[PDB]
Write a protein that binds this ligand. Sequence first.
Ligand SMILES: O=C(O)Cc1c[nH]c2ccccc12
Length: 577
Amino acid sequence: PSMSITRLFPALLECFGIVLCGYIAGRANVITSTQAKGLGNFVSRFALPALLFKNMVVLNFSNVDWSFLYSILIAKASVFFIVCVLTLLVASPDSRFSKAGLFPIFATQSNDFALGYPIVEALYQTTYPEYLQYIYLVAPISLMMLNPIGFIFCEIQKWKDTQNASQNKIKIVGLGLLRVLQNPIVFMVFIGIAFNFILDRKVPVYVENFLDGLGNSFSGSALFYLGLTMVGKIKRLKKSAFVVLILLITAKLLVLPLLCREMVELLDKGDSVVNHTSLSNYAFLYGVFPVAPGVAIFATQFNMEVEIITSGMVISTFVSAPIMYVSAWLLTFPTMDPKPLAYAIQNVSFDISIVSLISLIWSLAILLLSKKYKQLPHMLTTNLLIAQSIVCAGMMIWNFVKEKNFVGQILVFVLLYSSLYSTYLWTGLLAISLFLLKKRERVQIPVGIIIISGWGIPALLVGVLLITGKHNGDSIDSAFFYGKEQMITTAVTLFCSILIAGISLMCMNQTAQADQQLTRHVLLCLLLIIGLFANLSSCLWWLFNQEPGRLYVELQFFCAVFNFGQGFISFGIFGLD
Ligand SMILES: O=C(O)Cc1c[nH]c2ccccc12
């Protein structure tokens, strides 16, 4: 491909595995606060400056694509102006300046060095090595463009809160600009651009090896210190702050990458559509990088609004992993032929299945060791988690077995799609069971029957498939393995589970119009009903329409996201306690 996207899942799991290890080590008291502050000083005083010094001396400025820099800088300036004006017009009259200073920095400035760079290295080190340069151009230039406007607003808050409230605007501007110049990023970028010419882009060998030893450690060490600083740092936001934060994380991770893509499309006019499309897709990938930890440091230095900013940096860090994996593959699909595209969706399914199965094994282990799996509504959720685990496991086994014996393919198909149908039906059965719990006049729910229904009716539907369908031993995507009958059966399973679920939740509400965790159960059901409607749409599109008009590709991708990553929904609702 134009982009070595198979290395994205290992890259994401390396980066976020390091952040998760840092978070675990931080909780587990493996590391003292003196060690944590030593690590912060290593990361910020030596390693980041060394990485910047290295890359800035190396960089051949006369054959950078300045077009991409202008694009991302105009896009970040656009999201800056937008978020800044929106904040100053929306927020409360006194404290609006801290918000209007820090929020657009939050919405534009990203973690480009710690995890953007290993990700762009993974995606583009072979296919476009010049794209690794642009992190070191974009992130600093955007810092010294946009962070002084935001800092100047924050300093206006500091000056207005400071009861003297009348001093020089020049001093406000100067102190804001000074924090930008004192930042090791822009500091070292100026210094390294000077050394660029003083050495004519050649680091002396001894300096080169010293800078390599330090700079290469920045990626891993920065992500580990990020893990340490995440300890407890998502302190429970007020719901109004959560609303503000949803908008800001949407800004950084959806509006900015969309805007970057549009800007590159407007401003690049290079020679070929392939290089243009690759640069456009790189612009989107750039937008998706999470908020820079430096933004939390700025909020702490101003002593202002640490709660929203730290919580949002941490949440944005984690939310960028799904959106990056999703967005990168989604942007790749329009270039692929139908057969490579089937391999692409099975690759997506396999990756999401690994991380979903880990989340499900954790969630299962919680429900089992909690022994809450005995309770009447949670016994059924446990069976759903087992069905989701067998989905993800059957997908993992299937990704290998689709090459191996026809005997093995049929067995693994039976396991995989019977359990997939079982998760489908368990959505509806969990809804009808929480309706039975709400219809509290009733006897104890027939657990044996509801279990035999959720497991056995899908076994009957797949036995039906083996007997009534015909086998596509070529076909890569398991969802077409038994041809038309496969999708007919899938559609009927989805249609039944959606009818059951929707009628159950409607009737639950109509009963209300007169720990069981009925709210969390209905949340699990509702999010799964979104997924079931998506899968029903895929089935009914492929059935009633002969042609997969291109939305069918994006929808089959989201079907795979849901089918194999629904373990994330069940983990988010139960695995986090
Ligand atoms: O915030 C950034 O963009 C870079 C960075 C500076 N100090 C850090 C500590 C941990 C992780 C990343 C960073």
